């Protein structure tokens, strides 16, 4: 553990000082930052180093959830573990850009480390803050880039303020509809993804869509954005849209997509659960009553969960032995 944390902190100390968000479409244009990102970071020894520590942190963050109080991670190395997750996932996307597949055993290690760093409450409190927003945005682009490097053949799609905040947000909405279509084990659309990524990519898209940057947008179905709905958002982030009005929920397919997003997304701090409770009571022509009743059952069962209680990523329903 001490060797893992020291070497992870060293690899974060080798990173540059001021972080700019990763864009795989036009990377070389904005700055000479990418010169420093190919000099100390394009070396074969440093890329030989990073997924070994990703395996190390993957098993360590597995073990953290059942350790005594001496063996948990310190609060100082927490920012560094977040920056290391961002750096390794950018390394994975960078070798997808330049050379080949990364190793296809380092995809699995990088996504292990990122999923487990997204499930822990301290590391999620660090990622979901303001100072690492660019970092969080980079994760989104890199994760989608990796999915787009594997799932979608050329000539296809997944489904059939600065600029990067409003692109990563639509990117996550596309990935949630892909969880409906592409990343379902056994679907005919899932014939391209090699199935050692679909638990990892499914958990990482569920856990990234619950960020305070993205969740408020992600619960809104795209049939609402097709119609004339556009208020001005603000929460000191770019995208902090207000809650959906019940007048659009009197259509059925809009309401089916809303209950889909609120089922797969879960909830957050409790006030957003009371917001969803208020909307689903405001819904209560007879088909929508059936669907609202089923939504209320799914909410009351999403309050029934034995860990975090509102997160389908980390947690699962409580069952009692009758034996």
């Amino acid at each position: 553990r001490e060797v893992t944390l020291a070497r992870v902190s060293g690899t974060v100390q080798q990173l540059p000082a001021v972080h700019h968000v990763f864009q795989p479409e036009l990377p070389a244009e904005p700055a000479a930052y990418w010169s420093k990102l190919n000099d100390l970071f394009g070396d074969a020894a440093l890329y030989q180093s990073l997924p070994t520590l990703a395996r190390a942190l993957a098993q360590y963050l597995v073990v953290v959830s059942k350790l005594p109080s001496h063996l948990h991670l310190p609060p100082e190395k927490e920012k560094d573990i977040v920056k290391f997750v961002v750096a390794t996932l950018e390394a994975l996307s960078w070798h997808l850009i330049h050379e080949q597949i990364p190793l296809s055993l380092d995809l699995q290690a990088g996504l292990d480390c990122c999923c487990l760093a997204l499930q822990l409450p301290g590391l999620w409190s660090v990622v979901s803050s303001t100072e690492f927003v660019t970092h969080a945005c980079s994760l989104i682009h890199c994760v989608h880039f990796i999915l787009e490097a594997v799932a979608v053949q050329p000539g296809e799609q997944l489904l059939s303020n600065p600029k990067y905040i409003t692109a990563a947000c639509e990117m996550v909405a596309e990935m949630v509809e892909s969880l409906q279509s592409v990343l379902a084990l056994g679907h005919k659309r899932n014939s391209g993804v090699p199935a050692f990524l679909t638990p990892l990519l499914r958990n990482i898209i569920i856990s990234l869509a619950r960020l305070p940057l993205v969740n408020s947008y992600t619960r809104v179905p795209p049939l609402v954005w097709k119609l004339g709905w556009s208020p001005k958002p603000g929460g000191d982030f770019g995208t902090a849209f207000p809650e959906i009005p019940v007048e659009f929920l009197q259509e059925k397919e809009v309401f089916k997509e809303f209950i889909y997003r609120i089922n797969t997304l879960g909830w957050t701090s409790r006030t957003q659960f009371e917001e969803t409770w208020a909307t689903l009571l405001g819904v209560l022509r007879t088909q929508i009553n059936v669907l609202a009743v089923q939504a209320i059952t799914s909410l009351v069962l999403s309050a029934m969960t034995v860990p975090v209680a509102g997160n389908p990523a980390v947690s699962c329903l409580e069952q009692q032995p009758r034996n």
């Binding site: 795989p24 997808l96 850009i97 080949q100 597949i101 880039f145 787009e148 490097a149 594997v150 979608v152 053949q153 050329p154 000539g155 296809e156 059939s160």
Partner: protein, 647 residues
Amino acid sequence: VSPSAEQLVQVYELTLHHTQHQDHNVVTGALELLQQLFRTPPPELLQTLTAVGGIGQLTARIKGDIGQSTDDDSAPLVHCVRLLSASFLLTGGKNVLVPDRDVRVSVKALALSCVGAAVALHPESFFSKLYKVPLDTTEYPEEQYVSDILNYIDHGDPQVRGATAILCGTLICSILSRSRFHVGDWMGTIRTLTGNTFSLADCIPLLRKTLKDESSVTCKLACTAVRNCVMSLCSSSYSELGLQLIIDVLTLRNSSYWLVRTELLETLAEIDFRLVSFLEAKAENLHRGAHHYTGLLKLQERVLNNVVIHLLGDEDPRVRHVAAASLIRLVPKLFYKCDQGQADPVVAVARDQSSVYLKRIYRGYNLLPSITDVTMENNLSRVIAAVSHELITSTTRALTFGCCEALCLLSTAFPVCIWSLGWHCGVPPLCTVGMATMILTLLSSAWFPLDLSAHQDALILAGNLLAASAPKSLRVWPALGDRALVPMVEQLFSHLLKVINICAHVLDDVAPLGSFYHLPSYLRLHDVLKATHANYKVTLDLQNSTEKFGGFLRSALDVLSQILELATLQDIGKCVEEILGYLKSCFSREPMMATVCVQQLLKTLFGTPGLYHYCFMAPYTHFTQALADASLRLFEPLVIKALKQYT
């Protein structure tokens, strides 16, 4: 006496003069005449227009010296493209658009189609300068060419930005067909002749920009452009751009307009995928495309599994008919990897081009030894396995309802009697019975026989797949000799008699071996056929190929004939009078293929390889082997009815 050439040149100068008459109808009338006269030209007029002097050898809004079609040292189509471009759709000073106030939109559309066909006849006129004498350098600083025609991809409504798509497609096709794929020499001669800077590459994304467009009309016209263009692109030096256009057409298979999907599936039907497979074998950074995709780019198993067989389940019957025709046009052109014939795709392109340029039983079955291609049987077996997989695993009505049509057209196109090792899967193990058991379990349901345009195709295809076992099996129903084949045929035979039974009770207005009274499904068949016969007896339209009671009874007699090939006298001798009754009642509606059935019933009552092999060595061995060989009695009322129906 045939019409001469000078009369047609008088027609041509007439309808060049009547483009400038002030009207709305006269301009569009002369433009539709000139469009169609450039589409399907008479040969003498076309040989006079393609020539350099042309009309001189026969005689012995516009503000600059275009120069008439009488002057020499320039073809007349150069004058006509300059004249029509300067009069209708271009201002002679700058790349600037003429408004809809001055010239209407439909006039511009017909003008673009005229320029498209005139470039398809003669490409060099597209690179001509718009004024032969330069036009007033004080008022206008630069002089422009006819390439601002291609600035009408952004102009407003459809049918103008879609017409420049087919203009660019015919431009690229006619450049690659005019100069025999030596594009650098041709552009060298033109860049030394006129001063314009325009390559073919600078037109290909513009065409691509018309594929991602909002209107279905522009996507339809851009799709016809790709159909005209992509074969000349794909085998030329610009094959990367043609392959990217095949990809961008592949993005477009799921629009909500049926003409877009039919023309998509007619672009992808004319492609030879041995050459596309060669281009995939060469390519490195084309398998990626955008977004850095790692892995391969399999066009052949995506144009044949996600497009053609996927649009066999489309809701319109027109799309399913065109999808079956596209399967017929794609089965020879496949090149699946590692045959025991063609090895490389180079061997495939070589064997096609070298094979081009170096050279009474019924219709069902064959008894020849049948020398047969190997890669063609392999491709045909792959196609029938995919089509049978999307017939058995279907969850909809449209998949089976169009997939039996695809099987029936592959059966009439590639016959089961000849290509029997392609149709083979399973039955009699080794002259084959391929896959006919699923189809005879389709006809026994109470769901599938109620719509006729798939039931008659299933009858034809079941008759073919059971009659394909003729040379092997033959040595109740004593002639069959393969006992596991005895029930299936019996099923069809009883089914066909019952079907013919219903048609008798349809043509003779009679309320209700072969008997359909106690079966509760063939009464539903009677209700469907009675409704369709009422719709025929009300409406008078004689010359229709698709009638669904004429075609249905046609098929139900043809397959009964083709099955009656296999029978004997001991098998039919208890059933002849019933068939003759159901043919005396059913003669007047369709007599052409009801005397075929009497003919066949009268027969069986009276007893009755590596790019050195393919390019040189095999045609030379056949050539020298050839030069070595060269050194040396209830029928009679139906017969009377057939005689009267003859007279």
